[PDB]
Amino acid sequence: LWVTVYYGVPVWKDAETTLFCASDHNVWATHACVPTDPNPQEIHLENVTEEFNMWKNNMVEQMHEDIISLWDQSLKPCVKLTPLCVTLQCTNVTNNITDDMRGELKNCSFNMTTELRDKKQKVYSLFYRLDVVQINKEYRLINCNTSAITQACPKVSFEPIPIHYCAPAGFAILKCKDKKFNGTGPCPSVSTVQCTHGIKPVVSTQLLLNGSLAEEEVIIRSENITNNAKNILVQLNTPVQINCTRPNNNTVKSIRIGPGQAFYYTGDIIGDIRQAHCNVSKATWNETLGKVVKQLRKHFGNNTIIRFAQSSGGDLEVTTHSFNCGGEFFYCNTSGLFNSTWISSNDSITLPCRIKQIINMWQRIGQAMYAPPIQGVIRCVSNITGLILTRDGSTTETFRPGGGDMRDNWRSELYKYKVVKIEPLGVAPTRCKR
Amino acid sequence: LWVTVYYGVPVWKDAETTLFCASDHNVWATHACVPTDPNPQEIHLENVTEEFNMWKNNMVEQMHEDIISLWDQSLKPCVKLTPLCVTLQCTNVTNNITDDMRGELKNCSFNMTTELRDKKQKVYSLFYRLDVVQINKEYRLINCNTSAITQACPKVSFEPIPIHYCAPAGFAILKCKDKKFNGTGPCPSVSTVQCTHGIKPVVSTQLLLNGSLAEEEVIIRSENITNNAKNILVQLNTPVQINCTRPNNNTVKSIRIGPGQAFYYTGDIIGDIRQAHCNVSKATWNETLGKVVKQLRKHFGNNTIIRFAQSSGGDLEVTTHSFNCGGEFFYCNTSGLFNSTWISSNDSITLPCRIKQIINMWQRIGQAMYAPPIQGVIRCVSNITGLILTRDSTTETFRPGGGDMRDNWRSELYKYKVVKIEPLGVAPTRCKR
Amino acid sequence: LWVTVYYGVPVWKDAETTLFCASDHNVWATHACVPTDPNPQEIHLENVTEEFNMWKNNMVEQMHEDIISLWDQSLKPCVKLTPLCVTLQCTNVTNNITDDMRGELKNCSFNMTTELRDKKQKVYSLFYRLDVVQIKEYRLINCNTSAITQACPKVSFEPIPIHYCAPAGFAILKCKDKKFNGTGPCPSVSTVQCTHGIKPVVSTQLLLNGSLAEEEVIIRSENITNNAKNILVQLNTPVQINCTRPNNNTVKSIRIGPGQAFYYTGDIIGDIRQAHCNVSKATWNETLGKVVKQLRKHFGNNTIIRFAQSSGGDLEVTTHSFNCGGEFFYCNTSGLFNSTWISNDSITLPCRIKQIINMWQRIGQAMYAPPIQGVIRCVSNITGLILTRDGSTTETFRPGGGDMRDNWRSELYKYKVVKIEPLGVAPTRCKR
Amino acid sequence: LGFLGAAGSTMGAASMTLTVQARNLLTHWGIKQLQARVLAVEHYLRDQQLLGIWGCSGKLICCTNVPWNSSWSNRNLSEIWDNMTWLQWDKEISNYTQIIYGLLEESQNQQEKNEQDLL
Amino acid sequence: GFLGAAGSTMGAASMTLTVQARNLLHWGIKQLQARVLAVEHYLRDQQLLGIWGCSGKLICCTNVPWNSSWSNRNLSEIWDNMTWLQWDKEISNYTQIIYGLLEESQNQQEKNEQDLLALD
Amino acid sequence: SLGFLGAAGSTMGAASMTLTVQARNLLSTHWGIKQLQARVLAVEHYLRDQQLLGIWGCSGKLICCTNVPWNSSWSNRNLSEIWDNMTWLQWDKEISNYTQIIYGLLEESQNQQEKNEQDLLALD
Ligand SMILES: *[C@@H]1O[C@H](CO)[C@@H](O[C@@H]2O[C@H](CO)[C@@H](O)[C@H](O)[C@H]2NC(C)=O)[C@H](O)[C@H]1NC(C)=O
Ligand SMILES: *[C@@H]1O[C@H](CO)[C@@H](O[C@@H]2O[C@H](CO)[C@@H](O)[C@H](O)[C@H]2NC(C)=O)[C@H](O)[C@H]1NC(C)=O
Ligand SMILES: *[C@@H]1O[C@H](CO)[C@@H](O[C@@H]2O[C@H](CO)[C@@H](O)[C@H](O)[C@H]2NC(C)=O)[C@H](O)[C@H]1NC(C)=O
Ligand SMILES: *[C@@H]1O[C@H](CO)[C@@H](O[C@@H]2O[C@H](CO)[C@@H](O)[C@H](O)[C@H]2NC(C)=O)[C@H](O)[C@H]1NC(C)=O
Ligand SMILES: *[C@@H]1O[C@H](CO)[C@@H](O[C@@H]2O[C@H](CO)[C@@H](O)[C@H](O)[C@H]2NC(C)=O)[C@H](O)[C@H]1NC(C)=O
Ligand SMILES: *[C@@H]1O[C@H](CO)[C@@H](O[C@@H]2O[C@H](CO)[C@@H](O)[C@H](O)[C@H]2NC(C)=O)[C@H](O)[C@H]1NC(C)=O
Ligand SMILES: *[C@@H]1O[C@H](CO)[C@@H](O[C@@H]2O[C@H](CO)[C@@H](O)[C@H](O)[C@H]2NC(C)=O)[C@H](O)[C@H]1NC(C)=O
Ligand SMILES: *[C@@H]1O[C@H](CO)[C@@H](O[C@@H]2O[C@H](CO)[C@@H](O)[C@H](O)[C@H]2NC(C)=O)[C@H](O)[C@H]1NC(C)=O
Ligand SMILES: *[C@@H]1O[C@H](CO)[C@@H](O[C@@H]2O[C@H](CO)[C@@H](O)[C@H](O)[C@H]2NC(C)=O)[C@H](O)[C@H]1NC(C)=O
Ligand SMILES: *[C@@H]1O[C@H](CO)[C@@H](O)[C@H](O)[C@H]1NC(C)=O
Ligand SMILES: *[C@@H]1O[C@H](CO)[C@@H](O)[C@H](O)[C@H]1NC(C)=O
Ligand SMILES: *[C@@H]1O[C@H](CO)[C@@H](O)[C@H](O)[C@H]1NC(C)=O
Ligand SMILES: *[C@@H]1O[C@H](CO)[C@@H](O)[C@H](O)[C@H]1NC(C)=O
Ligand SMILES: *[C@@H]1O[C@H](CO)[C@@H](O)[C@H](O)[C@H]1NC(C)=O
Ligand SMILES: *[C@@H]1O[C@H](CO)[C@@H](O)[C@H](O)[C@H]1NC(C)=O
Ligand SMILES: *[C@@H]1O[C@H](CO)[C@@H](O)[C@H](O)[C@H]1NC(C)=O
Ligand SMILES: *[C@@H]1O[C@H](CO)[C@@H](O)[C@H](O)[C@H]1NC(C)=O
Ligand SMILES: *[C@@H]1O[C@H](CO)[C@@H](O)[C@H](O)[C@H]1NC(C)=O
């Protein structure tokens, strides 16, 4: 026989390239992305079993890195709190207390700058305790010896907007459509697209909010289920309704710092002072865990006994539910969610929750952002679509909430995608000659 | 009969793309527009009529954005003036005023820091009253509550440099030379050129200075002449000479405020303190205006009473002729030019001018520029090439003034549009594979 | 005959193109350059003589610009030291006089704010005379010019070989001619896609840590009969230089702001010692004799060649300077140019330490180099010299003031950039 | 003569000027020039790729097996090549050029299939 | 569905080659990298096919014989029961070898044609 | 075998056997932006060469014959000398000032050839 060649042959190879965004005032520069395809197509790939590995997926790495970069571009172009890093003369706010708020709200006076540099303003404001540290009466902001704090830019929205991603021509995105696919391995039912479904950049920990749901049943995905150093990703089939609040009618105040710039300070509270909290339906939560436990039993290989215990790291970013409600940051105590063992009305547990105003995204060093206060009362709702849980090192195993890497929120939603390049050229033996 | 393919077909479509900047330092930095011009000539297209809706040519938006980009990039590296927002102690300059600038200038004293943090210096300087606002002799500069302030670099002249704009590969610029054509419709005399002629980035209000002159006759252009709210653009065929000066001989002084960072300011005036002003020839202006009116009769009836008047309102940047003369900004009151009715010589018209040092160009906020002072005296001779005017019954009232810089750019960009080359097409013939 | 067009024709046009960076934590951000091919093809060409003019080599300009940009990028994200431009009270450190301390090291104290705008601290630190001027009242020299920025403590200054690559469609020609003076035609050539790595070694007067001449010393100049040109002399042998700053520096650090700190020398462990460099005298004298033998090949062997010091100019012009470990050293060269050549052997060169750095022969920038904790030891090779010729029957040569572009020009003398033009035409016997 | 010298002339006259017309194809502000260059390439390649698909690449003109439809337009050749310009023609066919392009792809596909049966 | 052919049923898929080729060709920088990459790959492959004497031609035969070292397969299932994918997985590193041969053959073929026309 | 530019020094005739190596090697942190531009330039140079081959009707070939005769006014040399003594570097220099003449002639010839083919095809 003879050798002949072909172009446009339907074969491919794994490849890693960049992703192109598509999106449809905000903090993701969504208006800087191409409009999405309102009528995209996907094809069933006939008679192909391919392999996916969500823990080796560069798409995850890229979306994670891109949000970090994007965040800074969105936050960078506005006023700093540098002149605000002064000694604070503080007392407690004891005026309208439920006694659960003791020491939580502080009243401090200080001397800050104004439009004319020779003049100073003696002003006062309110603080939430978590962001203020005693110097010894005399207090300073916690980040005064660590980082510059940028005031968040005032006309922004942090409510996640799903971003769709497209392969460059010559590349394609393979999706796993095989129900109950647990990662790392063969997926017999896949489809191919040029552009995929958008994913919301939800940033939270120990509860995954407003993501995808399992088609039928709770599924556990873990790089190594017996590795005591690993977490597990829990994808729920049933969303859990959660209701969070800041039950205070807030005022806001704005005082000039410099030449056309002002700081937004905390003002005061109308009505009394109350603790933030979150509610879930009780049976729904109990049934949810029964399903999780059933899946863990599958991994154990029997109807073994397990415990759900409390997180213990010395860090709010590790042990609490980290959540952005509107523009304010919740650090909720989740202890009422994981306080049981499993052996083979729906009044909520009203998780108490703390509010922090100055935050440090991604736990990096030398950066900080101040969240301006919001006037009025804040209420928000969400769907818990998954969990990030971990395990301890006997016969009974203990599972706990955990995972400090926001990259895994990306990983969870991206568990079903892989990128390949198309290889249109090939050769074959043939009866044909030139 | 079969549909065959032809490639390299001489056809085109309207398209949005940007234009290469070629210039042949300054704010319109040379290194920003390295390309020069070999001066290739264009090609006349016989039997081509092209509809130019000039009012919609987006390249004007591009010019607006490019000039501001160059402006800001050039000011970014200059010394900042933040330390100047202090309480000032100010009194009037009264001792050498020639019965005009009556408290026009202030004599201010203030506590400025110096190069070392531990040392302070007392500074005495003059300010135009237009830049200083009373706090309650306690004053502050007008920008201290709204914007940043930067000192312009002394090495930048800001003399407008004519930039031609050139199409990208796959694109071409259609230039129509049809005479006495308003520029919005099916213009019958078009040539294709890769590049436009060069247009100087002249910044002005009220009048259009140093632009292209109309061929043959004064022409009035507008998008919708009927709507008085639309600005009326007038292009003269004959320029009007205007002589603008600042008679005051100025002392320029400087201090060092920061680490190697100098500041320049106005010292005492050496000679008499005389008010700045501009002159035009009296007859020339009167003849010119009558010619404009003659053109109004092409839109208005023969017996329409045409009344010219000074602007009825707006801030100084709106009501006066605002322009850059030698680096300083003049605000000339044109009330002596627009005060007549047109229903049926060794002299001159003088307009008084005000001067400002804190400049807020492009009607933006949060940013401002400080013009360092000019040593000695200022003299500029410019050409009035046009007028931008609005309109307000047997009468019509015409009052001078325009909008932002897009009006200026738009008129100079006339006669051009940008299209994409579309070389592929089909047609029937006798050839079958 | 008929016109025939060929594609894939092996022909050249000289070209001026951009360069691509390739490599294999530091001030050059080398991690940002794609890794190289460890074994690039080198194609030897036969029957080609090509003119290589190093004085017209625009790759030098590109290295200059990229190195500067990298330098600035390194410093752009580092902490500013603006708050140090305060007045200081200073006296001499006279604790241990060994006669090296000829007023050079001073004990200064000043008032500076930190962390909160409400508080100040007194800072006690040591300075070198070179950077401090009198207003017991003194100010830092850098407060003359723009604000001073502290270099980042974890970014290294050790030169890393960088490979410059032609873009596709272009190639880099190199010649192998021995004794090639960088300006004439050179008959032995080859093609590479990328140059060998060239370290961005920065120095003046002496050319350090470069390549060596093959067999014989090479003297390269644009106009050899001029006295307004630098002469670059490549040695065919290295000479070893041992440099030390034999004072155990205790480095202190204070907060100055919101996660910001200043690093400075506080205490000195041991007596005060002068920094210095040691070069073998015997080795050096033979090396110089070789250079002299080569100078005579251009000027005649009926003359006298004298060596002297340069005269006039600032520290950066009159002394030898280099960076090692992030510290900037300035060394006297009296022992190197004190001879006349007519037809444990060691030279010790005294050295000093500067804190305020202003390189690239620029102004309007300033950098502060924080000190090394303990004692720095440094070893370097002299691979070439920068000579200046003077303007009857005998002549004198002096060390040149330097131009950083000369260091690169010297290493690049061997290379040229060429554009490959695959189309061409020739007459044939074939017609269609 | 010259670039677009035949614009405004008849289709016939312009059919021999396809050469010069084809010959004219192909510091953050600086991104604009990079983008312009890239776009010129993108447009060029789209045309070359399409001609490639139809089997017309490499030539100024190409013949097909697709018949002309009177339902698209019905103008005589004595009117089309002699009394019509390409600018006007292009406007007349704007309603159906894309139909034609699809038809051309189909015809080339049949030809390649036929070639494959012999090969 | 430009990749509707999964690599399966390659025989029938040889007529979808046209179709597959139809879609050939801080966010601002990413888009530039993405689009130039599509261009680079397109040109890379078009260049390579062109050097083998085929251009715009989806399927072409040449004067290079097939070697047993490349395939000792049945030759009886390649279209109907062999996936282009599985075959490619079993390329056995002859990609460069074959390509070099294709260039050599064409080089000589072009020369031969030139010489025949020169003879005219 | 030879490396990519190993053809240098060979005669023009000998060099005709290296056309494949020369042709197959065509197209072979913001301070790195120049790398994007460099790749773009490589593409532009490539496409310009391809267009020229296209307009002359020599696309997809390393060598292409014509219907345009050679003018001795461009170069008058023995055929044997041209192919055996001369190399391509030397040769190109001898005809540098006639390059555009030749290119114009080649394109016009192709323009006429294609029209003639269309008429013949239309006839039968
Ligand atoms: C202000 O609030 C702080 C807590 O934020 C009070 O300090 C603690 O008070 C509780 C009782 O409520 C004690 O059990 C803790 O031991 C106290 N802490 C320490 C370190 O001693 C503080 O007493 C309040 N001060 C005023 C004036 O109300
Ligand atoms: C523009 O149109 C005029 C006619 O309106 C063209 O002049 C005619 O050109 C043809 C072609 O050479 C001659 O046969 C006619 O005799 C000319 N005039 C007439 C109408 O008799 C002119 O050539 C056109 N120019 C172009 C090329 O656009
Ligand atoms: C600076 O001069 C102005 C102008 O003469 C003074 O303001 C005027 O004061 C008179 C009374 O003497 C009033 O009748 C005018 O109406 C005022 N003019 C305006 C525009 O308000 C001003 O007080 C002088 N200031 C100083 C510091 O000497
Ligand atoms: C500019 O000139 C165009 C003609 O080229 C004028 O457009 C016509 O205006 C009349 C109304 O007077 C309409 O009935 C026509 O249909 C318009 N024709 C076209 C081709 O647009 C236009 O009005 C003039 N503009 C001004 C401000 O006078
Ligand atoms: C320019 O000069 C005119 C006078 O020619 C000023 O007109 C004033 O208009 C108001 C009504 O708004 C009258 O009450 C005043 O009496 C008029 N002034 C005079 C002197 O007659 C006009 O305000 C001046 N404009 C600017 C910007 O200076
Ligand atoms: C403004 O006044 C100063 C004097 O205060 C003028 O300075 C003169 O400059 C000339 C050279 O141009 C010298 O010869 C004179 O000696 C200087 N002094 C005097 C008193 O003339 C300055 O030229 C004046 N500027 C203008 C524009 O007239
Ligand atoms: C500090 O060091 C300086 C520099 O060595 C000393 O200044 C010298 O003092 C002698 C007199 O003792 C003079 O003859 C020199 O001319 C001075 N040199 C310079 C450069 O000024 C200074 O005296 C020393 N001070 C103390 C207290 O030891
Ligand atoms: C470096 O070598 C070249 C090559 O010899 C010199 O260039 C010329 O060489 C010829 C002889 O080969 C002499 O006749 C010329 O006078 C030389 N000069 C020039 C400008 O062509 C070149 O001069 C040498 N340069 C050095 C630094 O010695
Ligand atoms: C470079 O020149 C040499 C001559 O010195 C050429 O070598 C000859 O090549 C032919 C084949 O073409 C042999 O038959 C001769 O025997 C060789 N001569 C010698 C002395 O060995 C060489 O081919 C030329 N070009 C290249 C690229 O090598
Ligand atoms: C596999 O290919 C056959 C065609 O022979 C098709 O009928 C079948 O559905 C394919 N399997 C899938 C869809 O994976
Ligand atoms: C809240 O403030 C009101 C007065 O405005 C007071 O009557 C009420 O008791 C306060 N509530 C608490 C919890 O102290
Ligand atoms: C503000 O400054 C005054 C001195 O002018 C001082 O007495 C007062 O304590 C300062 N205020 C605060 C809150 O520190
Ligand atoms: C200004 O003062 C000078 C004397 O210094 C005097 O000759 C001149 O007339 C004065 N001018 C005015 C307007 O007062
Ligand atoms: C400068 O500051 C002092 C107080 O230290 C004050 O008395 C004086 O009036 C100020 N001077 C000026 C011109 O502002
Ligand atoms: C030098 O330093 C040592 C360190 O202890 C000390 O013992 C000695 O006396 C000092 N000598 C001088 C020169 O003062
Ligand atoms: C600090 O400031 C005080 C002000 O009274 C001054 O006396 C002292 O000398 C200064 N100290 C230093 C080290 O600059
Ligand atoms: C495989 O090869 C054998 C001969 O060794 C032959 O009999 C058989 O039919 C072949 N398989 C197919 C599918 O033709
Ligand atoms: C090109 O013209 C120059 C004169 O400008 C002449 O010296 C050179 O030899 C000419 N080259 C050719 C190939 O004719």
Amino acid identity of E108?
Q
Alpha helices by DSSP H, listed for chain D, are 11-14, 18-22, 31-54, 77-80, 86-92, 97-118
**Contact residues on chain C for A143, CB-CB shorter than 8 A:** 258-259
DSSP letter at C147 equals P
**Contact residues on chain B for A118, CB-CB shorter than 8 A:** 86-87, 111
**Contact residues on chain C for F15, CB-CB shorter than 8 A:** 9-10
Count CB atoms within 10 A of the CB of residue B180: 9
Assigned token pair, A363: 């736990």
CA dihedral F61, F64, F67, F71 (to 10 degrees): 140
What per-residue string of b and e applies to B123-147 under the rule 16 or more CB within 10 Å gives b?
bebbbbbbbbeeeeeebbbbbbbeb
Strand pairing partners for C265? Answer: C251
Q: What are phi and psi of C395, to 5 degrees?
A: -145, 160
Alpha-carbon span A363 to A367, nearest angstrom: 9
Q: How open is the CA angle A304-A306-A309, to the nearest 5 degrees?
A: 175
Q: How open is the CA angle B341-B343-B347, to the nearest 5 degrees?
A: 50
* Sequence-ordered list of residues with C-beta below 8 angstroms from that of B227, at least 6 positions apart, any chain: none
Sign of the CA dihedral with B382 first, then B385, B391, and B397 last: positive
Count CB atoms within 10 A of the CB of residue B172: 22
The number of C-alpha atoms within 13 Å of A359 and in the hemisphere containing its C-beta is 21
- SS3 call for A166: strand
Q: Does residue B182 come out as left (phi exceeding 0), alpha (psi in the -120 to 50 range) or beta?
A: alpha
Which value in Å is the resolution of this experimental model?
Answer: 4.6
What is the SS3 assignment for E60-76? EEEEEECCCCCCCCCCC
Chain D residue whose CA is closest to B167? D36
Alpha-carbon span A310 to A399, nearest angstrom: 9
What per-residue string of b and e applies to D62-78 under the rule 16 or more CB within 10 Å gives b?
bbbebebeeebeebebe
CA dihedral A312, A316, A319, A321 (to 10 degrees): 160
The distance from CA E7 to its chain's CA centroid, rounded to whole angstroms, is 15
| CA dist A411 → A42, A189, A196, C81, C398 (Å) | 22, 20, 15, 42, 66
Closest residue to atom 19 of ligand 3, CA basis: B103
Domain B19-79+150-200+405-415 class? mainly beta
Whether the Cβ atoms of residue C59 and residue C412 lie closer than 8 Å to each other:
yes
Strand pairing partners for A347? Answer: none
| CA dist E95 → A6, A426, E98 (Å) | 13, 9, 5
- Give one DSSP letter per residue of B277-305, joined into a string: EEEEEHHHHHHHHHHHHHHHTTTS-TT-E
* Sequence-ordered list of residues with C-beta below 8 angstroms from that of E26, at least 6 positions apart, any chain: A66, A69, A70, A73
Sign of the CA dihedral with D54 first, then D59, D61, and D63 last: negative
Assigned token pair, A253: 């105040």
Amino acid identity of B184?
T
Alpha-carbon span B319 to B335, nearest angstrom: 10
Alpha-carbon span F124 to C245, nearest angstrom: 94
Alpha-carbon span A116 to B143, nearest angstrom: 11
DSSP letter at B69 equals H
Q: So where are chain C's domains?
A: 2-77+156-423
Assigned token pair, C415: 């290379």
Terminal CA-CA length for chain C: 12
Element (H, E) at B165: strand B163-166
| CA dist F14 → B75, D102, F64, F83, F86 (Å) | 61, 47, 17, 8, 10
User: Touching E: which chains, 3+ CB pairs < 8 A?
Assistant: A, C, D, F
Q: Which among A104, B4, B100 has a CA at the least distance from the CA of D60? A: B4
Whether the Cβ atoms of residue D102 and residue D62 lie closer than 8 Å to each other:
no
Q: What are phi and psi of F117, to 5 degrees?
A: -65, -40
Alpha-carbon span A307 to F79, nearest angstrom: 94
Q: Does residue B376 come out as left (phi exceeding 0), alpha (psi in the -120 to 50 range) or beta?
A: left
Assigned token pair, C294: 């080569």
Closest residue to atom 12 of ligand 15, CA basis: C96
Nearest ligand 4 atom to alpha carbon B222: 27
Amino acid identity of A351?
L
Whether the Cβ atoms of residue B173 and residue B196 lie closer than 8 Å to each other:
yes
Closest residue to atom 14 of ligand 11, CA basis: A96
Breaks (C-N over 2.5 A) in chain C follow: 24, 135, 343, 391
- SS3 call for D48: helix
Assigned token pair, B136: 């309650």
Alpha-carbon span B172 to D21, nearest angstrom: 11
Q: Which among C13, C46, C19 has a CA at the least distance from the CA of C421? A: C13
Among B89, B91, B92, B108, the mutation site with the greatest number of ligand 3 atoms within 8 A of its Cβ is B92
Q: How open is the CA angle B204-B205-B209, to the nearest 5 degrees?
A: 50
- SS3 call for B145: coil
Q: Do residue C146 and residue B115 have CB atoms under 8 angstroms apart?
A: no
Whether the Cβ atoms of residue A218 and residue A397 lie closer than 8 Å to each other:
no
Strand pairing partners for B221? Answer: B233
Say which CATH topology domain C2-77+156-423 has.
Answer: HIV Envelope Protein Gp120; Chain G (2.170.40)
Residue C92, ligand 7, Cβ within 6 A: yes
Closest residue to atom 4 of ligand 14, CA basis: B111
Alpha-carbon span B341 to D66, nearest angstrom: 71
DSSP letter at A281 equals -
- Give one DSSP letter per residue of B82-141, joined into a string: GGG-S-EEEEE--TTB-SS-TT-EEEEEEEEE-SSTT-EEEEEEEEEGGGEEE---EEEE
Q: Do chains A and C touch (3 or more CB pairs under 8 A)?
A: yes
Measure F119 CA to nearest chain C CA, in Å: 19
Q: Do chains E and A touch (3 or more CB pairs under 8 A)?
A: yes
* Sequence-ordered list of residues with C-beta below 8 angstroms from that of A202, at least 6 positions apart, any chain: A160, A208, A209, A210, A211, A409
CA dihedral A194, A197, A203, A209 (to 10 degrees): -160
Assigned token pair, A422: 């198309």
What per-residue string of b and e applies to C347-365 under the rule 16 or more CB within 10 Å gives b?
bebbbbbbbbbbeeeeeeb
Q: Is A118 on the interface with B (CB under 8 A)?
A: yes
**How far does the centroid of ligand 13 lie from the alpha carbon of residue B272, in Å?**
6
Long-range CB contacts (within 8 A, 24+) of C178-181: C178/C213, C178/C214, C178/C215, C178/C216, C179/C213, C179/C214, C179/C215, C179/C216, C179/C218, C180/C52, C180/C218, C180/C413, C180/C414, C181/C218, C181/C219, C181/C220, C181/C221
Amino acid identity of A20?
F
Count CB atoms within 10 A of the CB of residue C262: 21
* Sequence-ordered list of residues with C-beta below 8 angstroms from that of A28, at least 6 positions apart, any chain: A67, A70, A74, A161, A163, A201
Amino acid identity of E93?
N
Q: Do residue C83 and residue B117 have CB atoms under 8 angstroms apart?
A: yes
**Contact residues on chain E for F60, CB-CB shorter than 8 A:** 50, 53-55
Question: A with E: how many residue pairs have Cβ under 8 Å apart?
Answer: 157
Whether the Cβ atoms of residue F63 and residue C5 lie closer than 8 Å to each other:
yes
- Which of B80, B114, B118 to mutate against chain C (most C CBs within 10 Å)? B118
Alpha-carbon span C183 to C218, nearest angstrom: 12
**How far does the centroid of ligand 6 lie from the alpha carbon of residue B271, in Å?**
10
- SS3 call for A291: helix
Q: Does residue A218 come out as left (phi exceeding 0), alpha (psi in the -120 to 50 range) or beta?
A: beta
Q: How open is the CA angle B356-B357-B363, to the nearest 5 degrees?
A: 75
Alpha-carbon span C149 to C357, nearest angstrom: 10
Question: Counting ligands in written order, which one lies closest to the CA of residue D8?
Answer: 2
Amino acid identity of C78?
C
- Give one DSSP letter per residue of A64-115, joined into a string: HHHHHHHHHHHHSSS-B-GGG-S-EEEEE--SSB-SSSTTTSEEEEEEEE-S
Assigned token pair, E14: 């040889």
Alpha-carbon span B213 to B220, nearest angstrom: 12
Strand order in the sheet with B12-14: B12-14, B416-421, B171-176, B190-193, B43-44
Q: What are phi and psi of A188, to 5 degrees?
A: -75, -10
Q: Is B366 on the interface with A (CB under 8 A)?
A: yes
Q: Do residue E25 and residue D49 have CB atoms under 8 angstroms apart?
A: yes
Alpha-carbon span A118 to C217, nearest angstrom: 67
Q: Which among C386, C384, C397 has a CA at the least distance from the CA of C308? A: C397
